[PDB]
mmCIF file of C-alpha atoms in Angstrom:
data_model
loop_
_atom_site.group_PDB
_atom_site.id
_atom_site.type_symbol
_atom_site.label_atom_id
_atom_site.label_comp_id
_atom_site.label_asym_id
_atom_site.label_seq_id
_atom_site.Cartn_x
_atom_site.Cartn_y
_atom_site.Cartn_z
ATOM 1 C CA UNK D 1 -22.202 21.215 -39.161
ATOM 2 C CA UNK D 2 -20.058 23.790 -37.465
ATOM 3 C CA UNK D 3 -20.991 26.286 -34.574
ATOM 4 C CA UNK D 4 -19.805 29.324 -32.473
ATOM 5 C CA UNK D 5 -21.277 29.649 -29.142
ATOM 6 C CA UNK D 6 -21.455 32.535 -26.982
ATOM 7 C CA UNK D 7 -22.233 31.489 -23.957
ATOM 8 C CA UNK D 8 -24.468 34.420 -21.682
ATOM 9 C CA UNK D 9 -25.465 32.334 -19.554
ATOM 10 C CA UNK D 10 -28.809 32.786 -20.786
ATOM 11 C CA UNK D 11 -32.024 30.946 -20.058
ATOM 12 C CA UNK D 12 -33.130 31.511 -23.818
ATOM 13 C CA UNK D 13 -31.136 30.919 -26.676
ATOM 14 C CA UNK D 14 -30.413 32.560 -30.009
ATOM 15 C CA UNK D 15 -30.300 30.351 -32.976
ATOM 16 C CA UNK D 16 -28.704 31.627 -35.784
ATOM 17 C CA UNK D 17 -28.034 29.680 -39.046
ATOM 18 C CA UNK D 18 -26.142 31.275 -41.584
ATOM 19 C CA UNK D 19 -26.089 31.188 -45.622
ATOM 20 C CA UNK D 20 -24.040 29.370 -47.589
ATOM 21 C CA UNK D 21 -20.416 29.891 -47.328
ATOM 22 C CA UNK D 22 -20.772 32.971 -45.192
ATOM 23 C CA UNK D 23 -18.395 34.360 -42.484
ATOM 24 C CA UNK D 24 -20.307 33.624 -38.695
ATOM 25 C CA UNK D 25 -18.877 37.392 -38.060
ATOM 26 C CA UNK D 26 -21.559 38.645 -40.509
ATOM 27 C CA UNK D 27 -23.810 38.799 -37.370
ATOM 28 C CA UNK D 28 -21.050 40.143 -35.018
ATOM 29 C CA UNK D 29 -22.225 43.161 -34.442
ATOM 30 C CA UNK D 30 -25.428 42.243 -33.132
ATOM 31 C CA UNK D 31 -26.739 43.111 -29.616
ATOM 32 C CA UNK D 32 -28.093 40.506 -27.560
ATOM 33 C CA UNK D 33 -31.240 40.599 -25.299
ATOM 34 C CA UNK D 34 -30.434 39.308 -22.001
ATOM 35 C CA UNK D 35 -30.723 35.911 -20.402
ATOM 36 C CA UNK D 36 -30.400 34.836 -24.168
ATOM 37 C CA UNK D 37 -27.005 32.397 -25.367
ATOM 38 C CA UNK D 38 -25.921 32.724 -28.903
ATOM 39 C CA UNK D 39 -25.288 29.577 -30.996
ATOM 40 C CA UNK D 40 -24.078 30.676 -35.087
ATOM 41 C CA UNK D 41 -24.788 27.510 -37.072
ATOM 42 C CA UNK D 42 -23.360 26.984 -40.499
ATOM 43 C CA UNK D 43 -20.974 24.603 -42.765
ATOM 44 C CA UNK D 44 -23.557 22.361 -43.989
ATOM 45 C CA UNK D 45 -21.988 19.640 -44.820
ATOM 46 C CA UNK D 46 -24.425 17.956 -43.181
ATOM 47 C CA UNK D 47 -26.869 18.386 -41.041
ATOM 48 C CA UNK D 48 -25.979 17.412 -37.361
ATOM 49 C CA UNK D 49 -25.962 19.690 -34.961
ATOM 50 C CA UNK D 50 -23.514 18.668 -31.455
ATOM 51 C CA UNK D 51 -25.188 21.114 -29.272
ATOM 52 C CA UNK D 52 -28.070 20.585 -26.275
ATOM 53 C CA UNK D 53 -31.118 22.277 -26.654
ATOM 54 C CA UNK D 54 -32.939 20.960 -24.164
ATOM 55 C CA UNK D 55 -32.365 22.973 -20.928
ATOM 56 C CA UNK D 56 -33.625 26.284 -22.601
ATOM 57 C CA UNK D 57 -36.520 27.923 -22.100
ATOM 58 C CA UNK D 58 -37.528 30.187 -25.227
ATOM 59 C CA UNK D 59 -35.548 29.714 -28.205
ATOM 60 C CA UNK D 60 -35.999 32.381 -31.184
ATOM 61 C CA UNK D 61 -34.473 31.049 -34.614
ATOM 62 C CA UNK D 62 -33.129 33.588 -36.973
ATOM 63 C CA UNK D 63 -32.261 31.888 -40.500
ATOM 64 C CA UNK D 64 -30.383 33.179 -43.655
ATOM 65 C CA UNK D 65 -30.587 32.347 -47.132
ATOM 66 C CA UNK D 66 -30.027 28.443 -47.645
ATOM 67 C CA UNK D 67 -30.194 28.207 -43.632
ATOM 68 C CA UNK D 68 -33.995 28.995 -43.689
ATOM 69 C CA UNK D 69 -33.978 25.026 -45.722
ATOM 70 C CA UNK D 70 -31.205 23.728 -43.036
ATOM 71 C CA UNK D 71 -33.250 24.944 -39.960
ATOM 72 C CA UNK D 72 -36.206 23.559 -41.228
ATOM 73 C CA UNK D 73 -34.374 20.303 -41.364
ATOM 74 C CA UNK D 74 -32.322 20.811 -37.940
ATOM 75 C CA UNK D 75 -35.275 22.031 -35.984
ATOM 76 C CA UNK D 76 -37.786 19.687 -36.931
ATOM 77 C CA UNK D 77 -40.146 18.584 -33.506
ATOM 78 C CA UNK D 78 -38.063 21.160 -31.608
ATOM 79 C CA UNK D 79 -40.444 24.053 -29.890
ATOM 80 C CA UNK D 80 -39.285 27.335 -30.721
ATOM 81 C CA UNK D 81 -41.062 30.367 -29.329
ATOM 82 C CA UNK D 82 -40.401 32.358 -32.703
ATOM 83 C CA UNK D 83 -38.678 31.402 -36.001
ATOM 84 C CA UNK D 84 -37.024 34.410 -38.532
ATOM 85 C CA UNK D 85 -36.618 33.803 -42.410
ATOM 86 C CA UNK D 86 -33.962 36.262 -43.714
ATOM 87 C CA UNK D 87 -33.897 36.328 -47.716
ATOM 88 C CA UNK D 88 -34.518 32.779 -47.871
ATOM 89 C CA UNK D 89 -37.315 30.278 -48.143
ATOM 90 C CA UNK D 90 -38.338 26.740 -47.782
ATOM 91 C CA UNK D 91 -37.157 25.559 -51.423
ATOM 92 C CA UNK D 92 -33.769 27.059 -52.046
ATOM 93 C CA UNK D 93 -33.420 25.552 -55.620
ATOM 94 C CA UNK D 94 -36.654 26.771 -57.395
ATOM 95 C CA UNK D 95 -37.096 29.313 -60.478
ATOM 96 C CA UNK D 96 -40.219 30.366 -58.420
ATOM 97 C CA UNK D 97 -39.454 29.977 -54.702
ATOM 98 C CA UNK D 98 -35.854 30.601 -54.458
ATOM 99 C CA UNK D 99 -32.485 30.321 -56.602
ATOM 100 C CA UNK D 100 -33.128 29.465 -59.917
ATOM 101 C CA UNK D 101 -32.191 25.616 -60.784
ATOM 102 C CA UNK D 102 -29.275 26.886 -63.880
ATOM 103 C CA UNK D 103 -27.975 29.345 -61.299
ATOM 104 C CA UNK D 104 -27.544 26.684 -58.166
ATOM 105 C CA UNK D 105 -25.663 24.439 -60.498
ATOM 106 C CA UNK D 106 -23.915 26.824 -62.384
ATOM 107 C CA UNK D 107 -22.533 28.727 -59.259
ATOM 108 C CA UNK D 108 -21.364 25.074 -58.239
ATOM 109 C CA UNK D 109 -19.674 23.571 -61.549
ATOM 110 C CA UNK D 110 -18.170 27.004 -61.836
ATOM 111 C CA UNK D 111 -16.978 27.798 -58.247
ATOM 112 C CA UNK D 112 -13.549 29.334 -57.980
ATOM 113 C CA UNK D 113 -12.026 31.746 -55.499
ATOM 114 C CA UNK D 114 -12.612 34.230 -58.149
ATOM 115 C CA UNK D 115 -15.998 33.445 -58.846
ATOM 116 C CA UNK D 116 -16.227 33.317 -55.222
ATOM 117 C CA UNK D 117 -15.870 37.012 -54.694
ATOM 118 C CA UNK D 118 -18.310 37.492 -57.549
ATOM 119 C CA UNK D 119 -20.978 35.651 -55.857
ATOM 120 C CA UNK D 120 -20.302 37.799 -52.910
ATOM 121 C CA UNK D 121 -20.588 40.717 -54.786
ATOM 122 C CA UNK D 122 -24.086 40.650 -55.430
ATOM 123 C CA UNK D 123 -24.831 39.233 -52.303
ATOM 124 C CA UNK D 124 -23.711 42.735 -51.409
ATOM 125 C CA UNK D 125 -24.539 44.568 -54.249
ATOM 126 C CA UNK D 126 -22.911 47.414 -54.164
ATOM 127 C CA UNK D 127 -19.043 48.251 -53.942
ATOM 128 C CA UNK D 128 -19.048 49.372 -50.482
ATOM 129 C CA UNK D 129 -21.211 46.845 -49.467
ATOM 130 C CA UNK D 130 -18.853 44.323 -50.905
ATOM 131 C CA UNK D 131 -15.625 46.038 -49.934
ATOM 132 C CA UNK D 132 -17.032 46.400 -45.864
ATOM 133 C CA UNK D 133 -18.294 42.670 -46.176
ATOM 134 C CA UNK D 134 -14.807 41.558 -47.332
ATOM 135 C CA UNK D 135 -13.477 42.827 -43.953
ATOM 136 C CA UNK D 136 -14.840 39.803 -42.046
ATOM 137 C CA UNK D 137 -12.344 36.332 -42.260
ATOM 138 C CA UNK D 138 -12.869 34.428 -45.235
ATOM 139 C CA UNK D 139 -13.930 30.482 -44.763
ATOM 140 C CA UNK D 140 -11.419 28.349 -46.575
ATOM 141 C CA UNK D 141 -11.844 27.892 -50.638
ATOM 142 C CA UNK D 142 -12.030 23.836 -49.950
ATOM 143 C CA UNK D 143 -14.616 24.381 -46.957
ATOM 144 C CA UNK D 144 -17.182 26.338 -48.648
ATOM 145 C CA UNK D 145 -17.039 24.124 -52.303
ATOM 146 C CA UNK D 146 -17.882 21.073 -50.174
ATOM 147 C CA UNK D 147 -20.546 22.668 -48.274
ATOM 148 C CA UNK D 148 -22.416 23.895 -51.623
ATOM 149 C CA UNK D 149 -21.778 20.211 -52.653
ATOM 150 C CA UNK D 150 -23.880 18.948 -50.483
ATOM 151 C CA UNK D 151 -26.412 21.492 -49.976
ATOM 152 C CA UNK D 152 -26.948 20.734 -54.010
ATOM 153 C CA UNK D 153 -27.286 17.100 -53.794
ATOM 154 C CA UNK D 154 -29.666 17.220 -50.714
ATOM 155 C CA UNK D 155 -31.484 20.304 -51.968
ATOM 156 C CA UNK D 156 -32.495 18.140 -54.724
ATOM 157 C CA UNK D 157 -32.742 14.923 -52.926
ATOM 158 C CA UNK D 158 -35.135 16.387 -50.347
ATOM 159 C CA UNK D 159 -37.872 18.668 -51.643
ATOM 160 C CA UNK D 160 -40.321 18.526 -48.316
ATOM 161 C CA UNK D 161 -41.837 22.074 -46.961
ATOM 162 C CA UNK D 162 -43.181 23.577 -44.045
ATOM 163 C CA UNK D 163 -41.893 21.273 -41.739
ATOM 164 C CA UNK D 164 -41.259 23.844 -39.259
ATOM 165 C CA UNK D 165 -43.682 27.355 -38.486
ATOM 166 C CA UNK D 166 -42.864 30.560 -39.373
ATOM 167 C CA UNK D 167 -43.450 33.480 -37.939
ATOM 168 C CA UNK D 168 -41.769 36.206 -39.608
ATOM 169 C CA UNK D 169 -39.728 36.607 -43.067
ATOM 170 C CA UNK D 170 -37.704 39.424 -44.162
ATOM 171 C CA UNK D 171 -37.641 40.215 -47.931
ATOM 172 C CA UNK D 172 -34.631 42.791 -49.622
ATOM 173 C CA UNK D 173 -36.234 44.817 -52.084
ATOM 174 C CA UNK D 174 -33.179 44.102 -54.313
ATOM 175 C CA UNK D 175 -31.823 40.624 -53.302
ATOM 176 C CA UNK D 176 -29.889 39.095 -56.151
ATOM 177 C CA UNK D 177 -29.632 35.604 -55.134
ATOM 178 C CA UNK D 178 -33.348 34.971 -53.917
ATOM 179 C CA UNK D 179 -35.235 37.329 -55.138
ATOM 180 C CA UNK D 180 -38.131 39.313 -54.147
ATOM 181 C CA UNK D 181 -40.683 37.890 -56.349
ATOM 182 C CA UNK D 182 -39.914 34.650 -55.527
ATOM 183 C CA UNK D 183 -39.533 34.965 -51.596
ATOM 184 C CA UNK D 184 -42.807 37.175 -51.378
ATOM 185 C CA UNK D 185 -44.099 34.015 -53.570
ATOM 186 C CA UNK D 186 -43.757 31.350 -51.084
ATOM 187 C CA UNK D 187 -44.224 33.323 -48.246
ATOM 188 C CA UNK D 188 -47.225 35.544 -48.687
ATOM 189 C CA UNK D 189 -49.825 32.709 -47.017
ATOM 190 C CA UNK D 190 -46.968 31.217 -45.207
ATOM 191 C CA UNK D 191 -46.506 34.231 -42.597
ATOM 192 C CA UNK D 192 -45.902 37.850 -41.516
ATOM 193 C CA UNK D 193 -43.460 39.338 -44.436
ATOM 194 C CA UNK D 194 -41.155 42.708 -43.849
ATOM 195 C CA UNK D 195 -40.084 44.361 -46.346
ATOM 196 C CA UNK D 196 -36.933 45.790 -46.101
ATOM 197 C CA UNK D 197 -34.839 48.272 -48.290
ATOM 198 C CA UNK D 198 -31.588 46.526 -49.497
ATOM 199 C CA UNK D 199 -29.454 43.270 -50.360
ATOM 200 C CA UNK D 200 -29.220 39.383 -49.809
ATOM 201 C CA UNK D 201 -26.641 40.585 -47.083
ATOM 202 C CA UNK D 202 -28.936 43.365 -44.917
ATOM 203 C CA UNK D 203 -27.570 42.548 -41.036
ATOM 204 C CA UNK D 204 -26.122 45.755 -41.334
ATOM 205 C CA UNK D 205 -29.278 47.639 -41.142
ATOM 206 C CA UNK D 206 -29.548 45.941 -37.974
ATOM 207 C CA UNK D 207 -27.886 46.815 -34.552
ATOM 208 C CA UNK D 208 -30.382 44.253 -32.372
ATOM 209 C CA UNK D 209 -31.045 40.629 -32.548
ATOM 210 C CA UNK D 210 -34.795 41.148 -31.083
ATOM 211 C CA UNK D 211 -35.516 43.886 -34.434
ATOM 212 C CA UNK D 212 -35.346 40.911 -36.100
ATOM 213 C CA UNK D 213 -38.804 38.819 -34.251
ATOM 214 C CA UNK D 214 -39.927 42.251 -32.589
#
């Protein structure tokens, strides 16, 4: 997969993995604690991650949307001192626990830059949601159908849970593309949930990368 580090010179690090074809600028505007690194993961076209983990102390993941399934994958074995679910959950492609099975493969056998911007739309919701989130620099058409591609095929292919802890999840009262019931579903034994007034996309509510574990 891809990544964008920014490099604090931190003794902690801030893991980050974004959803599905999502701009790594969604999370810009976010304030860092200090003596914490930044590393934005996304592109999952597969799931290697070129980056050393080892000489870091703490390391608090913070996980969006189909990411919460990567990370899980990624982070397997690795300590982390906290891990954040944002509007996602541990099975991505489930009419119960996360996108409806019709709706993961329809988005994909129907994916054009037009139905693109739809899908971002109610990620959004709202018109001025959508129109501020079309401000950050689109990922290329070709990029983003080969990353759903195989998040589809290995979604399916791999159907394993809880192979990493939890210790907080964030639920949107009015996320479109995993929604409420089915979040609060999988994780109401699972861990601490907070609920939150908005969409799939709600980083702007946020100015602070610790509001999201503290």
């Amino acid at each position: 997969m891809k990544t964008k580090f920014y490099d604090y010179q931190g003794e902690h690090l801030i893991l980050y993995f974004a959803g599905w074809g999502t701009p790594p600028d969604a999370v810009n505007h976010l304030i860092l604690p200090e003596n914490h690194d930044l590393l934005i993961c996304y592109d999952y076209q597969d799931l290697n991650l070129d980056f050393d983990l080892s000489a870091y102390r703490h390391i608090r993941l913070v996980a969006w949307s189909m990411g919460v399934w990567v990370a899980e994958r990624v982070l397997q074995g690795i300590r982390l001192k906290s891990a954040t679910a944002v509007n996602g959950t541990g099975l991505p492609c489930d009419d119960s626990f996360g996108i409806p099975y019709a709706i993961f493969k329809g988005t994909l056998e129907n994916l054009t830059e037009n139905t693109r911007l739809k899908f971002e739309r109610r990620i959004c919701g709202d018109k001025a949601s959508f129109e501020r989130y079309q401000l950050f620099p689109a990922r290329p058409f070709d990029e983003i159908h080969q990353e759903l591609t195989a998040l589809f095929a290995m979604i399916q292919q791999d159907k394993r849970i809880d192979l990493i802890h939890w210790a907080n999840a964030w639920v949107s009262s009015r996320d479109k593309i995993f929604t409420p019931a089915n979040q609060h579903q999988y994780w109401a034994l699972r861990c601490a949930v907070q609920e939150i007034e908005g969409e799939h996309y709600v980083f702007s509510r946020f100015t602070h990368w610790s509001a999201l574990w503290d």
